[PDB]
Amino acid sequence: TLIVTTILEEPYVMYRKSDKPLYGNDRFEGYCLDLLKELSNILGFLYDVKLVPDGKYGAQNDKGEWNGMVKELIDHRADLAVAPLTITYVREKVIDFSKPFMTLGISILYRKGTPIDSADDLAKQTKIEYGAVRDGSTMTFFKKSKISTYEKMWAFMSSRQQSALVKNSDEGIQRVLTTDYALLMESTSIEYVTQRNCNLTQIGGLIDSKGYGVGTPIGSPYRDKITIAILQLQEEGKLHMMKEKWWR
Ligand SMILES: N[C@@H](CCC(=O)O)C(=O)O
């Protein structure tokens, strides 16, 4: 029944690996898929998982137009957006979000053993390239930040745009591995990476504080119900278990 838009991002949404042929929703696994299964049991609904066609989370272009999963919800092309989608002020003007099912903050993914300790250290220099995922909430944060240092940084990554910004997190992580590059990535995603490559580390603390929520078109009856469901899973300690299962 319900159409759920999502995006491939480890360990939230991934293609399940099997020796036998997988069809439909079975092709996907991960934190967000366990959550979606839970939500459909609690609210009792069927669903079809579809990746967002342009592979973007969603940003508003210079002419006011949106893309990514946000656009899909806006154009009623999807009922739910269940993915590590950041709840932001700008997005709340065009779609509704459930209450957060996970919290995080923008931080820095970089290698270990350098004198770089914060965004400032990155900002006041130029040898180390740094950037974020194109059309994601992190890129938008820097693009709209009125704080000098972040404003300085947006200037840097937007000039070297075609280069500083990456298509997705996997490409950004690979850029951190094979280049002198620091990735502006969200904290729980960084936790997952550094947890698997002891050469990588989080630089500084969180630049901001926020959360991930299930997106729905504006005025959807499902939003409050999903919030109630998230609150239940939280209450019975399943959100913790799910986090531990995937981040291990
Ligand atoms: N979670 C972000 C994407 C990743 C990022 O921009 O750091 C979003 O909802 O757009």
186 marked among binding-site residues:
yes
Q: Is 173 exposed, middle or buried (0-12, 13-18, 19+ CB in 10 A)?
A: buried
188 marked among binding-site residues:
no
* Location of each CATH 3.40.190.10 domain in the chain: 1-104+210-248, 105-209
Residue 136 Cα to ligand 1 midpoint, Å, equals 4
Q: What is the 3-state composition of the chain as percent helix, strand, coil, each rounded to the nearest 5?
A: 40, 20, 40
- Method of elucidation: X-ray
Whole-angstrom distance, CA of residue 232 vs CA of residue 248: 22
Q: According to CATH, what is the number of the domain 105-209? A: 3.40.190.10
Residue 27 Cα to ligand 1 midpoint, Å, equals 23
The token duo for 13 is 């949404």
227 marked among binding-site residues:
no
Q: Is 130 exposed, middle or buried (0-12, 13-18, 19+ CB in 10 A)?
A: buried
Q: How far apart are the first and last CA of the chain?
A: 32
Taking the CA of residue 184 as reference, the ligand 1 atom at the shortest distance is 7
What is the pairing mode between strands 106-111 and 129-131? unpaired
The token duo for 52 is 């967002």
Q: Residue 26, Cβ neighbours under 10 Å: how many?
A: 12
Assign 180 to helix, strand or coil. Answer: coil
Whole-angstrom distance, CA of residue 96 vs CA of residue 225: 12
This structure's resolution (angstroms)? 2.1
CB half-sphere exposure, 81, CA atoms < 13 A: 33
Whole-angstrom distance, CA of residue 96 vs CA of residue 241: 26
- Whether the CA torsion 48, 166, 96, 40 is positive or negative: it is positive
Q: Is the distance from the beta carbon of residue 85 to the nearest atom of ligand 1 less than 6 Å? A: yes
Assign 1 to helix, strand or coil. Answer: coil
Ligand 1 probe mutation, 102, 142, 186, most atoms within 8 A of CB: 186
Whole-angstrom distance, CA of residue 191 vs CA of residue 24: 30
Q: According to CATH, what is the number of the domain 1-104+210-248? A: 3.40.190.10
Q: Residue 230, Cβ neighbours under 10 Å: how many?
A: 23
- Closest residue to atom 4 of ligand 1, CA basis: 136
Side chain identity at 44, as an amino acid letter? G
Residue 20 Cα to ligand 1 midpoint, Å, equals 33
